[PDB]
Design a protein around this nucleic acid. Structure first.
Ligand SMILES: Nc1ncnc2c1ncn2[C@@H]1O[C@H](COP(=O)(O)OP(=O)(O)OP(=O)(O)O)[C@@H](O)[C@H]1O
Ligand SMILES: Nc1ncnc2c1ncn2[C@@H]1O[C@H](COP(=O)(O)OP(=O)(O)O)[C@@H](O)[C@H]1O
Ligand SMILES: [Mg+2]
Ligand SMILES: [Zn+2]
Ligand SMILES: [Zn+2]
Lengths: 49, 371, 49, 353, 247, 556, 59, 79
DNA sequence: TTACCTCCATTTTTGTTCGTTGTATTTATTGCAATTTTCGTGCCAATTTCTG
DNA sequence: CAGAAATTGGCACGAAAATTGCAATAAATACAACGAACAAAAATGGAGGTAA
């Protein structure tokens, strides 16, 4: 994972009941950006026609 | 006995959770008629209009063309106050559903229906409309000269109009087609080694059932099924091997080298009733490096050979194809000339037989092939 | 060949490897399962085990 | 004969206020069926068409395509309600394959395992016999005397093979002893309801006890329940066997254009094969020692079809997995009641975090 | 960077995270010092002296680090790697005591209590009490909302029971089980239940008529009979038992 | 670009149903009005989560759409979230603030000795807010404020009164939220969770539904804002270990040793020794917990005149425990006291206890011993929830048919309701048992034969107060067990509708409601067993009787 | 042991209930909530109450 | 009525009858083209019916009387 | 010694809700007599083609 | 702008080949597929004990 600067305090109910409030600089630096790769196949075969 | 050196994986987990899978039920699909009826329901018709629409959409084929004439539909309605103009109005309303041009009587109607839904700003619309409306066989027969006379138009406008014509859709109902076509698994394989064609049944299609005999009558009856399957596959293998042996030349040099063999030859070679031979070879295929061929494909008629013997109709068809394939565009070969040309290699087929073979191969006559 | 490939490909104890991160692979390889052929079942296990 | 009414009439709703349940007569089962199933095969593999007299035949259960007969002489809506003379197929909607049942003619009578094995045994309680003796008689283990006549024997007396042979060698043809489901059918048919109820009521009123009191009360209550409704005891032994509509038991389509039979189709094929073999043996007039085991096997096949695994070993098709039967389809957590009627999936719905 | 709820610490009894936070801050502090010694070109002597003083800190640790065996290039590359924070190891049942954490906080010139004074970003006003700030190691689990989100208004239905399929891969609907039926019975909403049972799931003509009426701006249903009930009737009849509706 | 405007137009007033599985009671499906947002996650109001048992750590929800007009009107009139404030199993509110809201309202409504601005006089709540916002006075200063409160008149009208109250700045600021009709005494105290719930209950009983709906949102907003302003954090220095802990532990150890030797002496068998050790350790654990709590709940401060005073502490752990925002005593004791006794999944108790806490840290043996409770609490959720699902299925299937089908059957029969006293303290007074039931006979004066309550009278709060005044100890009421209605029950034999307050209506399926009300707590508490961590629930068996009040002793 | 066989076969022990009811030739009047849920009708409770009353007036 | 329906329930007196009456009036205003009795402000046909019921302009008796009068008018046009 | 009551052994039924999910090998033939279907080619009529 | 000729297709002919019901089929030496069976609770039948 990543090291994050964290503070423990209530903030206007945006961390109510196990929610997490995240800064925008976290998004601006691609700290939690992932890459996902997918495979698709096409098969050409023989037919009676 | 080889291993496939490449392949495609299957998308699934190797192991499933131990609970039994639910019984197979199925899943509905949307064909052309389902879509057309869905659009019919959401359209402001009356009740009689809806009945006529149901009758019309019932009679639409896969390509989207109306297979029955309107008299059949009006008769099928079963009422006497309804005229044919109401049927025409309902048909015109239906023809503008999605895809545009469905339920069209013929190609001209479909093209005109598709053309009527454009904008006037289109560069050459009236020219295309006139060409479709009046002079269609001229465009199909590749005249391009008398069409210029009748249309009173120069080269460029006619060419652009034809470009617009070849931009439409002649089979509007095939956009909503089937999901994925089926495929056939071959029964037997013919490979070549030692200059000989080895014949072997498909291992991936023939498993050996586990013998359930431990609780022991029922054991004897179960073995009866085993013996019956043994005899069945033995008969299939023997018939296929004999057929492959007879048609060795074709497997090597391709077409034009078949032999005119009938069920009598197989029956006498394997010492079996010809009805059994007919039964076993039905709807079964063999895989060769040349393709996949039905086991009944190698049986045909014959023609007399001048020097002696017979010639397979398949060989005659292939020879006719190869003769047509290398003719001069200026003067395409005719049927009589083709017969005269083939009557130098011992081939003796009547003009009628040549015409039948040409029609079977779906090749236009000489006058339509001239450049 | 049939028996060997059946065991290696369609057995109960043969699974796809977890590949989220190295820890998943290491943990999956060092696993002990009481289920499978010759073992217990999720319905006949008991409570002391 | 009017398309407006025809289209309207097929979407009408049926009005009701109650549900009635009872037994089914052979006449009722025949009335339900649109045809007779003879052969076990499901689909012909030379033309990929349902076979004649099979589990999917078009002449019995309906067309495989909308407004088309099987051979193809009549093909459009103008020919609705017209039976093709060649193939015998009706020209109508394909969805009628969901609501047309068939029937199978059993060569020998067969008992309904539900009215024999669900405690208390209805057949046993009606006949006042232990379940063990009924199970002996049904599965070809012992003989039962129907009528004593002038012999020392009495009705509902259990005899073995050697005892039956000795009785024949001693007396002759002055008494009737049988075995199998035919004997039970005859015993049920020959009994009376009102006389038995009156006699049992008098016996209960005369004697004083507790165990016999409860047993007689249960027996007279069962007799009264049978009398009040229109049911008759002999209907508990099946003669004609209904066949579910094909569209509710579809074949499993694999790859390559082929199909695999499901559990219900497997059980239907098994019972059909056993019935055909038993009928052929009956026509041939084979020795009885063989027809006995054949009838026992047919009884087992029917019992496995109706409720698999209730008595004896459960029949499995592959991978040592039991085959689902009609009873398993009805009951359980996965049955109709608790999976498709008391809770169902709906449209216009979504989900997210 | 991230603001968490203090109330979630005592009710879950996972105190360790808090400790991690404190120790994490200490680590970061060390890095800052080293970073300050690199922005201004301090000579290698002071750098290595401070790094050795940081490494020797502890109460009888088992690790002996001697930087006199390091060439200046190795020391400089080590400082370059440590400039973002000195990584710290605490074995599972032989970890770091609170006193060592406090000493490490003192070395980096940070308050020992682990709490600083924060300010509000919107009003610039100081929060009334000291707040705990530190560095914690966060992960991103493989439950992405891109996969969960799903909706359906009309699709394909099962062939036998004529009910919508289930699953996002099948483009299916959400199950309405027995307990939801019990809840709707408890409320007393009979029309909602009736339209859940017939016109959304199984009334083959009801679905079509409902869709047509919705398109026409007329909200009204004409319910019929579910197809699953007819399937049940056929399955019961196949057992040799006569069941039917009447009157 | 126009389909978005169309979509905004077609969902203006069109409720949607939100559902979360498992649906344990009728509050698992609720109807809301949509607000279109950008994203891929549903947003839920914080005040309904307690009804859904929903938290934001991966929970998913399903959404359904009503179609017909009757369905939409049912969603708005029956299933809307503003119609479900009171619980159908208790009559107590379920739309209740928790966690951050409770913590904020508790922090703002407290007092401190010699704060900034203590001893000044204010002309109303507005001057209190103006002083607090400018920094001239603290939220805990003790001031004297002129307050105007409105009391309801006998004919249903408000009469105003103005007076100088001694209060704090925070309570004065909070007073602007309370609607007119309530007394000032409700907010003139530190507000926990019970106080907020009782205040909402009073608001519903006095004013109505709509003022309660507005009041709840105002409370939520104020609590969020001031909890954010507080900056209340948690640190490792907050947990305080009492000095006398190990001493107590030492004593307990000795006792065990003694009885252990007594087991080797032949004067006591194995089971007696087991029970004695368990009871000794339970007593020691209770002593340690009480000592820790006593040490934690007091602070020393400087008075304005220079001498020392002692007040309630401002420790963060103490506030989070005392306010009732989140966390229970059984979870706070293990942080700075001792873990105590664990339990195996079969339910038995382990002899060896743990004498360490989470601030000090366990060792290997203590952790291995404590893993048993983790196994127990984890296996409970996985296995013993079927034992309650089956129970609620059977209850629903047995009680489904029962529906209120009449208005009054006319019976005189009933049952006698008396208080439930077990031990020295009253478990259930008479007021709670008879609240909302219909009397079967005329209730007499306690000392004379004079009618106090006419028969067939619904007992709302006023009648309960009248009964409490004269000290009535038993009242006969009508119950469904004796009802003359055929195929159902009548409205009077059932009594009050617990979720609305007034009498029940005809056509209510009370059987399903009762089955759900009985079934839900079992499943809920079974699934909530791992919070304590697998600790043992045992109270030392008392060996004596100790009276608490003057009076006579009677034996039966 | 309820009067109706639909509301009992839906619950538990389908085989025994169906066999007993079929032998007895029972009849179900569709009176409770579950039987009306099965056939997709208005439950005789709450918003669907009054309608049911009207029905019994026509009978 | 956009938030609660307490006033309409108080006027009608029963919560289950309120839904039926409101649905009847709403279906009158939706598929019958009747004019509302109160000035609507971007409202659906359900909230309009609820707000009409709040004012005391609509209930079972009023709807029945209006239906009977309109049927009498249909008879008058018929004869 | 009579009927009546009671305790031991065998059988049958059941065991939470969503979300995820997941099977395949192909299956009887086999010989006739009659039947129906299809092959090569002739013959004449109705287009296209031809120059004049 | 025309009638005489090439050209192609519909109909027809015997005759040879492909297709269908309809009674009639095995069958031996040999173990070897499993699994290894949960916890409670209620009901019914049988062997044993008892009032008389
Ligand atoms: N087997 C189950 N059957 C039904 N509901 C379950 C089951 N397992 C878990 N749940 C649901 O999951 C909920 C648990 O919620 P969640 O996983 O968010 O954590 P939690 O109990 O709130 O605690 P924390 O978030 O503090 O770790 C239970 O309240 C219950 O509703
Ligand atoms: N078996 C279950 N049935 C219903 N809800 C569940 C179940 N298991 C978990 N949940 C709920 O779903 C949410 C997400 O669960 P999920 O992340 O899949 O479980 P985990 O966190 O154990 O991986 C949890 O907060 C929990 O409350
Ligand atoms: Mg959760
Ligand atoms: Zn036909
Ligand atoms: Zn009553």
């Amino acid at each position: 994972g990543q090291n994050m600067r964290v503070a423990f305090m209530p903030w206007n109910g945006y961390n109510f009941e196990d929610s997490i409030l995240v800064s925008e600089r976290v998004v601006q630096e691609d700290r939690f950006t992932t890459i996902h790769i997918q495979e698709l196949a096409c098969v050409s075969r023989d037919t009676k026609l | 006995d080889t291993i496939y050196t490449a392949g495609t994986p299957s998308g699934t987990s190797g192991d499933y959770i131990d609970d039994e899978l639910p019984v197979y039920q199925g899943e509905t699909t949307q064909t052309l008629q389902d879509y057309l009826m869905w659009q019919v329901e959401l359209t402001p018709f009356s009740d009689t209009d809806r009945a006529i629409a149901t009758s019309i959409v019932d009679a639409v084929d896969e390509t989207g063309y109306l297979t029955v004439p309107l008299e059949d539909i009006l008769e099928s309605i079963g009422d006497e106050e309804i005229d044919i103009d109401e049927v025409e109005a309902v048909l015109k309303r239906i023809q503008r559903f999605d895809p545009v041009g469905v339920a069209a009587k013929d190609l001209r109607d479909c093209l005109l229906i598709q053309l009527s839904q454009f904008d006037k700003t289109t560069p050459w619309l009236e020219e295309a409309r006139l060409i479709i409306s009046d002079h269609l066989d001229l465009l199909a027969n590749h005249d391009f000269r008398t069409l210029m006379r009748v249309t009173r138009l120069k080269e460029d406008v006619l060419k652009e109009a034809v470009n617009l014509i070849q931009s439409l859709d002649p089979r509007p109902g095939q956009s909503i087609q089937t999901g994925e076509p089926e495929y056939v698994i071959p029964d037997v394989l013919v490979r070549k080694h030692n200059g000989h064609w080895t014949v072997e049944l498909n291992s991936d299609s023939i498993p050996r059932l586990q013998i359930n005999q431990h609780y022991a009558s029922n054991l004897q009856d179960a073995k009866w099924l085993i013996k019956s399957l043994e005899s069945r596959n033995d008969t299939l293998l023997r018939v296929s091997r004999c057929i492959v042996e007879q048609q060795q030349a074709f497997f090597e040099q391709g077409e034009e080298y078949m032999k005119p063999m009938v069920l009598a030859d197989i029956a006498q070679a394997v010492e079996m009733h010809e009805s059994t031979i007919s039964r076993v070879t039905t709807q079964k295929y063999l895989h060769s490096p040349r393709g996949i061929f039905e086991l009944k494909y190698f049986f045909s008629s014959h023609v007399n050979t001048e020097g002696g013997g017979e010639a397979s109709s398949t060989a005659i068809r292939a020879l006719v194809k190869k003769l047509i394939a290398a003719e001069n565009p200026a003067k395409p070969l005719s049927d009589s000339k083709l017969t005269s040309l083939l009557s130098e290699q011992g081939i003796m087929v009547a003009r009628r037989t040549v015409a039948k073979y040409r029609e079977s191969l779906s090749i236009p006559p000489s006058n339509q092939r001239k450049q | 060949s049939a028996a060997v490939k059946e065991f290696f490909g369609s057995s109960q104890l043969s699974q796809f490897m977890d590949q989220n991160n190295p820890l998943s692979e290491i943990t999956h390889k060092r696993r002990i399962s009481a289920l499978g052929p010759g073992g217990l079942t999720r319905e006949r296990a008991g409570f002391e085990v | 004969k009017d398309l407006l009414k025809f289209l309207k009439a097929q979407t009408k709703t049926e009005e009701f206020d109650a549900i009635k349940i009872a037994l089914a007569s052979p006449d009722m089962i025949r009335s339900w069926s649109f045809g007779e199933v003879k052969k076990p095969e499901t689909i012909n593999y030379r033309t990929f068409k349902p076979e004649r007299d099979g589990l999917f035949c078009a002449r019995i259960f309906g067309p495989v395509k909308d407004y088309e007969c099987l051979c193809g002489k009549y093909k459009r809506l103008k020919h609705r309600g017209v039976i093709c003379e060649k193939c015998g197929v009706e020209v109508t909607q394909t969805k009628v394959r969901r609501e047309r049942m068939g029937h199978i003619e059993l060569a020998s009578p067969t008992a309904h395992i539900w009215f024999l094995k669900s405690l208390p045994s209805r057949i046993g309680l009606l006949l006042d016999m232990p379940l063990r003796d009924i199970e002996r008689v049904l599965y070809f283990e012992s003989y039962v005397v129907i009528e004593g006549g002038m012999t020392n024997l009495e009705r509902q007396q259990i005899l073995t093979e050697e005892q039956y042979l000795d009785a024949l060698e001693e007396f002759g043809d002055e008494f009737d002893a049988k075995m199998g489901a035919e004997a039970i059918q005859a015993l049920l048919k020959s009994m009376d309801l009102e006389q038995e109820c009156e006699q049992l009521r008098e016996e209960l009123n005369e004697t004083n006890s507790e165990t016999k009191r409860k047993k007689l009360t249960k027996r007279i209550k069962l007799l009264e329940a049978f009398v009040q409704s229109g049911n008759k005891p002999e209907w508990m032994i099946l003669t004609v066997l209904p066949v579910l509509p094909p569209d509710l038991r579809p074949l499993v389509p694999l790859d390559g254009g082929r199909f695999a039979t499901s559990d219900l189709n497997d059980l239907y094929r098994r019972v059909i094969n056993r019935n055909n073999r038993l009928k052929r043996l009956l026509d041939l007039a084979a020795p009885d020692i063989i027809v006995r085991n054949e009838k026992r096997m047919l009884q087992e096949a029917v019992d496995a079809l109706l409720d698999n695994g209730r008595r004896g070993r459960a029949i499995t098709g592959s991978n040592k997995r039991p085959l689902k039967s009609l009873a398993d389809m009805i009951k359980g957590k996965q049955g109709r009641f608790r999976q498709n009627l008391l809770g169902k999936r709906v449209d216009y719905s979504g989900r997210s975090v | 960077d991230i603001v968490l709820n203090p109330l979630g610490v005592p009710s879950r009894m996972n105190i360790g995270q808090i400790l991690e936070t404190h120790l994490g801050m200490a680590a970061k502090g060390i890095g800052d010092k080293i970073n300050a010694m690199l922005k201004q070109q301090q000579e290698v002597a002071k750098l290595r002296e401070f790094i050795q003083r940081a490494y020797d800190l502890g109460a009888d640790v088992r690790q002996k680090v001697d930087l006199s065996t390091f060439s200046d290039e190795e020391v400089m590359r080590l400082a370059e790697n440590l400039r973002k924070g000195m990584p710290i190891a605490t074995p599972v049942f032989d970890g770091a005591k609170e006193a060592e954490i406090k000493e490490l906080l003192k070395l980096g010139d940070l308050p020992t209590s682990g709490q600083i004074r924060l300010y509000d970003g919107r009003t610039g006003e100081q929060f009334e009490r000291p707040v705990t700030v530190g560095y914690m190691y966060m992960l991103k689990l493989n439950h992405l909302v891109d996969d969960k989100m799903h909706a359906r208004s009309t699709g394909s239905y099962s062939l036998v029971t004529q009910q919508p399929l289930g699953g996002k891969a099948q483009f299916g609907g959400q199950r309405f089980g027995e307990m939801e039926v019990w809840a709707l019975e408890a409320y007393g909403a009979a029309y909602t239940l009736q339209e859940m049972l017939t016109v959304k799931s199984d009334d083959v003509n009801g679905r079509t008529k409902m869709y047509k009426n919705i398109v026409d701006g007329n909200h009204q249903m004409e319910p019929g009979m579910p197809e699953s009930f007819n399937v049940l009737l056929k399955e019961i009849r196949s057992l040799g038992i006569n069941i039917e509706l009447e009157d | 670009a126009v389909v978005w405007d169309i979509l905004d137009e077609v969902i203006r007033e069109h409720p949607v149903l939100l559902n979360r599985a498992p649906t344990l009671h009728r509050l698992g499906i609720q109807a809301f009005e949509p607000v279109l947002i950008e994203g891929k996650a549903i947003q839920l109001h914080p005040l309904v989560c307690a009804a859904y048992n929903a938290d934001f750590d991966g929970d998913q929800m399903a959404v359904h759409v009503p179609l017909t007009l009757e369905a939409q009107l049912e969603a708005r009139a029956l299933m809307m979230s503003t119609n479900n404030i009171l619980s159908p199993a208790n009559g107590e509110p379920i739309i209740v603030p928790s966690q951050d809201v409770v913590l904020g309202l508790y922090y703002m409504t407290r007092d401190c000795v010699n704060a900034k601005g203590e001893g000044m006089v204010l002309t109303g709540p507005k001057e209190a807010e103006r002083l607090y916002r400018s920094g001239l006075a603290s939220l805990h200063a003790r001031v004297k404020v002129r307050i105007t409160e409105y009391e309801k008149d006998a004919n249903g009208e408000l009469v105003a009164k103005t007076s100088l109250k001694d209060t704090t700045v925070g309570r004065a600021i909070l007073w602007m939220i309370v609607p007119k009709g309530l007394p000032y005494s409700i907010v003139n105290q530190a507000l926990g969770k019970k106080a907020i719930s009782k205040m909402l209950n009073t608001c519903y009983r006095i004013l109505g539904l709509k003022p309660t709906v507005i009041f709840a949102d105002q409370i939520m907003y104020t609590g969020f804002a001031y909890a954010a302003r507080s900056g209340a954090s948690v640190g490792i220095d907050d947990m305080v270990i009492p000095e006398k802990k190990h001493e107590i532990i030492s004593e307990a150890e000795a006792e065990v040793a003694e009885i252990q030797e007594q087991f080797q002496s032949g004067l006591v068998t194995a089971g007696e020794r087991y029970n004695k050790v368990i009871d000794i350790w339970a007593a020691a654990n209770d002593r340690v917990s009480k000592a820790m709590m006593d040490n934690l709940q007091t602070e020393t401060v400087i008075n304005r005149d220079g001498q020392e005073e002692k007040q309630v502490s401002f420790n963060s752990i103490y506030m989070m425990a005392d306010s009732g925002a989140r966390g229970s005593a059984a979870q706070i004791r293990q942080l700075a006291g001792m873990r105590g006794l664990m339990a195996k999944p079969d339910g038995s108790i382990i002899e060896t206890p743990i004498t360490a806490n989470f601030r000090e840290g366990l060792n290997v043996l203590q952790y291995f011993i404590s893993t048993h409770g983790a196994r127990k609490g984890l296996a409970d959720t996985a296995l013993k929830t079927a034992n309650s699902g089956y129970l609620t299925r059977r209850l629903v299937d047995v009680a489904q048919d029962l529906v209120v089908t009449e208005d009054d059957c006319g019976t005189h029969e009933g049952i006698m309701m008396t208080p439930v006293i077990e031990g020295g303290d009253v478990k259930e007074p008479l007021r709670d048992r008879v609240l909302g039931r219909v009397t079967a006979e005329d209730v007499l004066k306690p000392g004379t034969a004079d009618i106090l309550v006419p028969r067939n009278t619904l007992l709302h709060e006023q009648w309960c107060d009248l009964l409490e005044e004269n000290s009535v100890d038993a009242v006969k009421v009508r119950s469904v067990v004796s009802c003359d209605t055929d195929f159902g029950v009548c409205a009077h034999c059932y009594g009050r509708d617990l979720a609305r307050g007034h009498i029940i209506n005809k056509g209510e399926a009370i059987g399903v409601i009762a089955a759900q009300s009985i079934g839900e707590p079992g499943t809920q508490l079974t699934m909530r067993t791992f919070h304590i961590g697998g600790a043992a629930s045992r109270a030392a068996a008392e060996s004596s009787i100790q009276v608490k009040n003057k009076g006579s002793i009677k034996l039966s | 042991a309820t009067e109706s066989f639909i509301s009992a076969a839906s619950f538990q022990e389908t085989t025994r209930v169906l066999t007993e009811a079929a032998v007895a030739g029972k009849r179900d009047e569709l009176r409770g909530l579950k039987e009306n849920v099965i056939v997709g009708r208005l439950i005789p409770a709450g918003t669907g109450y009054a309608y049911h009353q009207d029905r019994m007036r026509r009978r | 009525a956009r938030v609660t329906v307490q006033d309409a329930v108080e006027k009608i007196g029963n919560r289950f009858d309120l839904v039926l009456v409101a649905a009847r009036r709403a279906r009158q205003m939706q598929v019958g083209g009747k004019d509302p009795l109160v000035p609507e402000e971007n409202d659906k046909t359900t909230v309009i019916a609820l707000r009409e019921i709040e004012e005391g302009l609509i209930n079972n008796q009023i709807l029945d009387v209006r239906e009977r009068q309109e049927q009498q008018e249909q008879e008058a046009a018929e004869l």
